Design a protein around this ligand. Structure first.
Ligand SMILES: Nc1ncnc2c1[nH]c(=O)n2[C@@H]1O[C@H](COP(=O)(O)OP(=O)(O)O)[C@@H](O)[C@H]1O
Ligand SMILES: Nc1ncnc2c1[nH]c(=O)n2[C@@H]1O[C@H](COP(=O)(O)OP(=O)(O)O)[C@@H](O)[C@H]1O
Ligand SMILES: Nc1ncnc2c1[nH]c(=O)n2[C@@H]1O[C@H](COP(=O)(O)OP(=O)(O)O)[C@@H](O)[C@H]1O
Ligand SMILES: Nc1ncnc2c1[nH]c(=O)n2[C@@H]1O[C@H](COP(=O)(O)OP(=O)(O)O)[C@@H](O)[C@H]1O
Lengths: 206, 207
């Protein structure tokens, strides 16, 4: 159960307050290495649940800050707007001490910009809108300590390979990288080769 | 992580420290948490590198001592070679002082190994050929195995023990925990994982 893991009381409170008590098989498998700062690839069948495998480690690794205009120390990339909002919602709830900002197309071009300018600790973004702000200097990725690629195989199918690589290339290689994907197409193995540091593959095979 | 960082009995931690075993290799670090909690796993790392503690410490921690004379082993480790059976037995013996480990291997001493098995054992570390000999004789009884380990599955397939391994695993109850270590997963080994393991997690540190 989550209380078993070594997580700050605020985080356990947040989880407890929300009913989340038992990690899914992929979460239980991935949490230990992720919490310890190591790079990993988490692979499991879609529809089981794995968001806590990267959100808890972001919650735990990052001390809070109130510095206006601060750059984000965590970046989560998702292939769709609806997943960016679901993930930003989860992360916001388990990291109550962090300012989480969702970046995604179709709306809020001005509002999301303003949010990022005021300050952010973690960004959950679709690659389109994110790359826009990257090019404008609005999204600054130079302080990223944890980068997460959520559903790498979908980002490939949606044709975001170029945006994803540009975004990762803008983060410091001192970062921890986590990659989650039901399948591992050649593109994702390459991302692994090029952007990760001796990653452990963790695969719930059946 | 160091070994001290894991939830292990004090006697086991003392054993480790006294031998200057402090630092799990990458596969040990990645696999210990699942193994300790009793889950099935496949550990993949390049052949021969250190991984013995990834299954030795789970066996040491899981099994309580017993005095019963003639008792059947609660853990089985299979290895492709005699030299690997011997290495692993000594290692397991070292970190599981509360258990009686018996090494079972060909090329020598049919009677000595047999008599050791009849006196009783908690863990057997075996090569598949010799082990099947004893299984069929009724000397090696696998009906109480809680942890079964295949150490270097891809080499067992290479050495021609495909059938012997399947026969040994079949003689153990499905309620067991099963740990499979191999640098590569040929078709036979995947088939093994599919049909002999329960919801296994594959852990691959080859990178
Ligand atoms: N351990 C857990 N327990 C309960 N809910 C969880 C959970 N982990 C987790 O992510 N969730 C919830 O599951 C939701 C996503 O579920 P999906 O779309 O079926 O995940 P998929 O298997 O990746 O395709 C998240 O927003 C979490 O709130
Ligand atoms: N359910 C869905 N089905 C199809 N396309 C979708 C989708 N959800 C979703 O977000 N998309 C598309 O995936 C992309 C989301 O990334 P972005 O950063 O918002 O891209 P930008 O529009 O260039 O700023 C958009 O094309 C979405 O319409
Ligand atoms: N955590 C650990 N620390 C020290 N020794 C260990 C160990 N785990 C483990 O199995 N051993 C021993 O290390 C031996 C394998 O080490 P090698 O041949 O030098 O290859 P390399 O690991 O690539 O450097 C095993 O036979 C064990 O007895
Ligand atoms: N370094 C090595 N090189 C080649 N063969 C080896 C070997 N080490 C080793 O053990 N073998 C062979 O691997 C087999 C070990 O299994 P068994 O249970 O002893 O099988 P049995 O023949 O029924 O007694 C034997 O053939 C060993 O000679």
């Amino acid at each position: 159960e989550f209380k078993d893991f070594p997580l700050k009381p605020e985080i356990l409170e947040a989880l407890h307050g929300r009913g989340l008590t038992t990690p899914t098989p992929i979460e239980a498998a991935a949490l230990p290495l992720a919490l310890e700062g190591k790079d990993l690839i988490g692979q499991a069948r879609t529809g089981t649940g794995k968001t806590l495998a990267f959100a808890l480690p972001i919650a735990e690794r990052l001390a809070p800050s109130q510095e206006r205009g601060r750059k984000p120390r965590a970046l989560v990339l998702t292939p769709t707007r609806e997943l960016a909002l679901q993930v930003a919602s989860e992360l916001t709830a388990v990291a109550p001490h962090l300012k989480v900002v969702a970046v995604y197309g179709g709306t809020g071009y001005g509002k999301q910009k303003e949010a990022l300018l005021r300050g952010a600790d973690a960004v959950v973004a679709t690659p389109g809108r994110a790359l826009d702000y990257l090019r404008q200097g609005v999204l600054d990725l130079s302080r990223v300590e944890v980068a997460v690629l959520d559903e790498a195989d979908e980002m490939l199918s949606m044709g975001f390979e170029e945006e994803v690589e540009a975004l990762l290339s803008a983060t410091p290689p001192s970062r921890q990288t986590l990659l989650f994907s039901a399948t591992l197409p050649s593109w994702a193995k390459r991302l692994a080769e090029r952007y990760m540091k001796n990653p452990v593959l963790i695969n719930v095979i059946k």
